[PDB]
A paper describes a structure:
To further investigate the active site, a PaFabF-C164Q mutant was generated that mimics the acyl-enzyme intermediate, thereby forming a competent state to bind the inhibitor platensimycin. The PaFabF-C164Q mutant crystallized in a different space group (C2221) compared with the wild-type structure and the structure was determined to 2.40 Å resolution. A dimer constitutes the asymmetric unit and the structure is essentially identical to that of the wild type, with an r.m.s.d. of 0.24 Å for the overlay of all Cα atoms. The binding-site residues are also well aligned, although we note that Phe400 is rotated away from the catalytic centre owing to an extension in the length of residue 164, where glutamine replaces cysteine. The mutant is believed to mimic the substrate-bound state of FabF.
Author numbering:
A (entry chain A), B (entry chain A): 2 to 413
The structure:
């Protein structure tokens, strides 16, 4: 009924590194990538730190002339995409390019570019807007430009499901491959909302931590002194591949993507329900899609955003799905270190989940000094935990109560 | 292998009407919905007309208090969604709500809201941004709020593939139902980019017609004196339903959704290739997905945007897919009347395609006074053409060279 889908390539920019292996070394070491933001003047803002991408040089991937039309969220998406296509060793030919596509998305897209063109329009009027504004700032153009730069002719689209984007992108790209619409898909997410509208919009909603004096401690999922999420930038991308197609060309396979689930809370615009019953259904859907019993799960990479309401819902949902086995699995939030990459969070965390399968180690939940009422599971507090990981889950639960769960598994 | 998917409900706001049947009466009569734009001062702009939604009253759907947080693209999406859920006669219960989802998207989303919050931020600083800015302006919240207002717990996501959004949303929602992930999906698209950044961004790219003296004549697909697309607002939404589920409750079925195809040009950021070879592959994929031979197609609702390069590519692609039969089918662009609803274009045109199957009539391509070189097919110039329509196709081809084709068919 379904062809099998594996991960043959990965790419990343995060607040911990300009590629995957540098970012992952950071994760394993408990390193925070959070810091006061240098690129702009945040003095008037109630929050002043974030996970920024540091030292990014777009001209590793594109000429200065190409790069200049494109919002940072696009540059970030192409870079992760390029890394991953490279990482995969895939050679794109006339014989396969119609079988290779792209699903790279974003939660908010080109907010920086829109900001800047907004300034021009207000001060100098319509004619000063760039002619590349639209193509260089709408969300589908990570997918757009990547297909052009790589001559990829397969399914070409983009999701935008806020903080769940990255997770849904990967899952539905795998469904493209399982359905026969593609053999290969580049999927993932990118974001750069660290601009005045991003930080101010999230500040206005009071959704962000305001621990300005100690930014590396701001993101503390399941800690009783948590005060909101930490906004972060970057991108993740995976090369998904039908199993036989990868065997045929001798691909290195990191892991198998076995399950994808989805759900809606149908509850509230920004807050999850106390019992996490939407997240519970999503994980259950993802497990059944993988043909798995809850007891076969060894590691969960949580959404774990460091909001009061969400961290606790996620515990409820895990306890209700997994029962007693909730105490045997390890769950951690690597947002404790990376911050919340929004639409890219799902993508980088899928990659963290795959790496956790490769190296048999559960990354840590840093800053988990005083676990709140109920937060009594193995949350890998403080430091990496080597252990058996056969099956690894990655959740994302975003505004609009939109939920997504991926299930990965060691390959053989 | 696949469950069968039918259309049981439809909703719409367009520049021709505040619902489906008013909009469709306009279409059949050759009525243009294009007019100089009243809602803002366009004097400094090189284009000054558009397809606006006229007389919209959001309080038919939501309280003033609800409505006020939400960008117009969201209001427009919920309204079409509500219409269509209503139109369908579906009763949402605890027994089915986990089987009912939403895929409603947009190409650019809340550009108006972002504009306004941009002004506040510039003049008055961060603290003046609304706390509802983010939830009320990001694209996934049509889906978000609809699932909350209707208690829908099934798959919840949103696409953003620019001018192809509406087409992809519907196609992938049908795939949700064919796969077993849902029995029912509300899918479609909404847009309101008629704000300074929209009109100015598209003006800066020189992509818009500038026929300000005669706006009802600006949109003239395949006419030799065409000078770019006409920007338009609104929304379409369809209730997709597994076939047995609809039979079981005695649903009225408009038509069957039998095919969905996708492709990438991999060519250019904004311009299609001269031969339309990407669009050709997309239609071919869509036909094969439907189990259909080209000769079985009676009517095509074209992308037909009134750009020089795109209108002509689409002819090339149709001639190459359909061969001699290209001269027996009828193709028309209802953008001649509606203008280009961008991310909603696909959604309203899917609805036009379904209505064309219901009433056995091909809508007209208005303004097609002098067909360009090569534009010698039956393009239903000027006035509606009653005829046999068993099978109807709807194309969309958007920036990034992203392509989508839907195939509908009379039900029995
Ligand atoms: K996660
Ligand atoms: K169309």
């Amino acid at each position: 009924s379904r062809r099998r889908v594996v991960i043959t390539g990965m790419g990343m920019l995060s607040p911990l590194g300009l590629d995957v292996p540098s970012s992952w070394e950071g994760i394993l070491a408990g390193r925070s990538g959070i810091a006061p933001i240098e690129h702009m003047d945040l003095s008037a803002y109630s929050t002043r730190f974030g996970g920024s991408v540091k030292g990014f040089n777009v001209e590793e991937y594109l000429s200065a002339k190409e790069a200049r039309k494109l919002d940072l969220f696009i540059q970030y998406g192409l870079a992760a995409s390029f890394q991953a296509v490279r990482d995969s060793g895939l050679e794109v030919t006339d014989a396969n390019r119609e079988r290779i596509g792209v699903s790279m998305g974003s939660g908010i897209g080109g907010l920086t570019n829109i900001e800047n063109n907004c300034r021009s329009l207000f001060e100098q009027g319509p004619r000063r807007i760039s002619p590349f504004f639209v193509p260089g700032s709408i969300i589908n153009m990570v997918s757009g430009f990547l297909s052009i730069h790589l001559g990829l002719q397969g399914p070409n689209y983009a999701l935008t499901t806020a903080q769940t984007t990255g997770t849904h992108s990967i899952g539905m790209a795998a469904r493209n491959i399982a359905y026969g619409e593609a053999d290969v898909m580049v999927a993932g997410g990118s974001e750069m909302a660290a601009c005045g509208l991003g930080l101010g919009g999230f500040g206005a909603a009071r959704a962000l931590s305001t621990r300005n004096d100690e930014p590396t401690r701001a993101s503390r999922p399941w800690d009783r002194d948590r005060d909101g999420f930490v906004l972060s930038d970057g991108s993740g991308a995976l090369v998904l591949e039908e199993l036989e197609h990868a065997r045929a060309r001798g691909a290195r396979i990191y892991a198998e993507l076995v399950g994808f689930g989805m759900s809606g809370d149908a509850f509230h615009m920004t807050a999850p329900p106390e019992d996490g019953a939407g997240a519970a259904r999503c994980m259950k859907n993802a497990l059944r899609d993988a043909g798995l019993d809850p007891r076969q799960v060894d590691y969960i990479n949580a959404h774990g955003t460091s909001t009061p309401a969400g961290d606790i819902a996620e515990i409820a949902a895990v306890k209700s799905v997994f029962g007693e086995h909730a105490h045997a699995l390890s769950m951690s939030s690597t947002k404790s270190m990376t911050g919340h990459l929004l639409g890219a969070a799902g993508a980088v965390e899928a990659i963290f989940s795959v790496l956790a399968l490769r190296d048999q180690v559960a990354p840590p939940t840093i800053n988990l000094d005083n676990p709140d009422e109920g937060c009594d599971l193995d949350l890998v507090a403080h430091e990496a935990k080597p252990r058996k990981i056969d099956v690894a889950l990655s959740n994302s639960f975003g505004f609009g109560g939109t939920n997504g769960t991926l299930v990965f598994r060691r390959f053989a």
